Amino acid sequence: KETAAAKFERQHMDSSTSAASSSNYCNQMMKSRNLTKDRCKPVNTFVHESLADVQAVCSQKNVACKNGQTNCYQSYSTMSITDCRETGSSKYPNCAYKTTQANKHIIVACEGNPYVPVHFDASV
Numbered sequence: 001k002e003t004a005a006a007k008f009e010r011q012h013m014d015s016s017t018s019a020a021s022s023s024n025y026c027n028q029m030m031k032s033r034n035l036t037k038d039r040c041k042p043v044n045t046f047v048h049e050s051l052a053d054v055q056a057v058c059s060q061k062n063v064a065c066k067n068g069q070t071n072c073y074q075s076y077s078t079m080s081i082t083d084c085r086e087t088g089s090s091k092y093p094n095c096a097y098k099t100t101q102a103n104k105h106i107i108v109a110c111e112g113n114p115y116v117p118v119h120f121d122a123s124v
C-alpha cells in the first residue's frame with residue numbers, strides 16, 4: 001500500500017508553503033495529513049522545502065540515527081521547519097497543537113533505490 005518514502009512525504013513534507021502562516025498551522029495540517037486518526041500523534045515536524053532538496057540530504061553529512069543505525073544524514077544548511085507539539089490539555093479526539101516555526105538543520109534516515117528519506121530523526 002504506502003511505501004516508507006510516501007509515508008515520509010505525507011507526514012513530513014510541506015512543499016506548498018515556505019513557513020507556517022499562523023499559529024493554527026499545526027492543528028490544521030496534523031488533521032489534513034491524518035496524524036489525528038486513532039490517536040493524536042504527539043510531536044511531528046514539517047519541512048517547507050522542495051522534495052528534491054530534502055532528497056539530496058541523503059548524500060550529505062552521515063551521522064548516527066537516534067536508534068543507533070548509521071543511515072542518517074544531516075543537512076549542511078538550515079531549512080524552514082515547523083515544529084508541532086501536542087498541548088498538555090489535549091485529549092484525543094480533540095487534538096490540540098502548539099506551532100513553532102524556525103530555520104534548523106534536519107537529520108533524516110535514508111533507504112532504498114533511489115536512496116530517499118524514510119524517517120525524520122531530528123532537527124538541530
Ligand SMILES: *c1ncnc2c1ncn2[C@@H]1O[C@H](COP(=O)(O)O)[C@@H](O)[C@H]1O
Pocket residue numbers: 001002003004005007
Ligand atoms: C503497502 N502496504 C504495505 N507495505 C507496503 C505497501 N507498499 C509498499 N510496501 C512496502 O512496505 C513498506 C511500507 O512503509 P513503512 O510503514 O514500512 O515505513 C514500504 O517501504 C514497502 O517496502
